[PDB]
Amino acid sequence: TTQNVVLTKYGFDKDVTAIDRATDQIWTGDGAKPLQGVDFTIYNVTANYWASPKDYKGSFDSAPVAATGTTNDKGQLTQALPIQSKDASGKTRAAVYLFHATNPRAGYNTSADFWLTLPAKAAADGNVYVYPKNVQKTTYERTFVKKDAETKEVLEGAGFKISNSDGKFLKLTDKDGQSVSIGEGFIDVLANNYRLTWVAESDATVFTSDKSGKFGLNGFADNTTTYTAVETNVPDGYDAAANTDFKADNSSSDILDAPSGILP
Ligand code: NA
Ligand code: NA
Ligand code: NA
Ligand code: NA
Ligand code: NA
Ligand code: NA
């Protein structure tokens, strides 16, 4: 015999704190953003808890995995869980489950671990509703406009790589670390739930100026680190721009490409 636990992850403004809600309350978020693609492990902590209930403080040491999952487009993750389970001595008990975020949405801190006993108070539909809490982090972005140095008009199709002070280069991956194909323009890492990794130059992501000359991305961790934009694919008939040092300071600035001279 099991109960359906429905986990819903909402994203909140940095300075707004959610009130606790009972497990029999169906809460729309009012209308905070549902967070898709968030990974949770549910641990069966029945044995850890019943070792000494008054001392339990959220340990999942040696606890088996009851289930894993990922939030969907509604920020939701559903899982049927046995209401009873065994303690360390093989005695049957009311089951205790601990919910552990293993991969938070880009731009968010990991949720706090929480746990509960089953059977729990359920909503009118028979489901048990939980709502993990976390804090949105402040991330930063940078935009560049590629231009013709002579005409001052924007330049489409110029390719760039980005390096850090270690000489490693930026590669965008999906939430699971896999490669992704990146096109032209400003890349919305936050909306796409991408990750910034630092790799060898040959494996780096190439960013390309779009029809308005624009390229760049959001999702930088800080605004103090210096990075370097290096032009790797120069439009035909131009000379490469000098390397451009920058901070992810939410600004936009121009990068100039000089037309190649032709002599008689
Ligand atoms: Na997981
Ligand atoms: Na355990
Ligand atoms: Na018992
Ligand atoms: Na994620
Ligand atoms: Na957690
Ligand atoms: Na791009």
Author numbering: 39 to 302
Question: Anything the authors wrote about it?
Answer:
The overall structure of the E139A-substituted mutant was quite similar to that of the WT GG-SpaA protein (RMSD of 2 Å). Discontinuous electron density was observed between Lys47 and Asn172 that can be attributed to the loss of the N-terminal isopeptide bond. The alanine substitution at residue position 139 was also apparent in the electron density map. Despite the overall fold of the E139A mutant being retained, some minor conformational variations are present near the mutation site, including the flexible AB loop region at the N-domain. For instance, individual side chains for the Asn172, Lys47, and Ser149 residues were now oriented differently due to the absence of the isopeptide bond and the subsequently altered hydrogen-bonding network. Here, the Asn172 side chain is repositioned closer toward the C-domain and thus able to form a hydrogen bond with the OH group of the Lys47 side chain. Moreover, the Ser149 side chain is rotated towards the domain interface. A water molecule, which is found in the place of the Glu139 side chain, is hydrogen bonded to the NH group of the Asn172 side chain. In addition, the slight shifting of the AB loop backbone has occurred, but with a major structural deviation (3 Å) at Gly69. Because the K-D isopeptide bond was held intact, the structure of the C-domain was seen to be largely unaffected.
As the first reported host of “non-pathogenic-derived” pili, Lactobacillus rhamnosus GG is a gut-adapted commensal lactic acid bacterium (LAB) and one of many clinically investigated probiotic strains for human use in the prevention and treatment of certain gastric ailments. As with other Gram-positive bacteria, sortase-dependent piliation in L. rhamnosus GG (called SpaCBA) is assembled from the ~30 kDa SpaA (backbone), ~20 kDa SpaB (basal), and ~90 kDa SpaC (tip-located) pilins. Two immunoglobulin (Ig)-like subdomains comprise GG-SpaA, each having the conserved residues of a canonical E-box motif and internal isopeptide bonds formed between either lysine and asparagine or lysine and aspartate residues. Our findings show that the GG-SpaA structure has certain features in common with other pathogen-derived pilin-proteins, such as the Ig-like CnaB-type folds and the presence of internal isopeptide bonds6940.
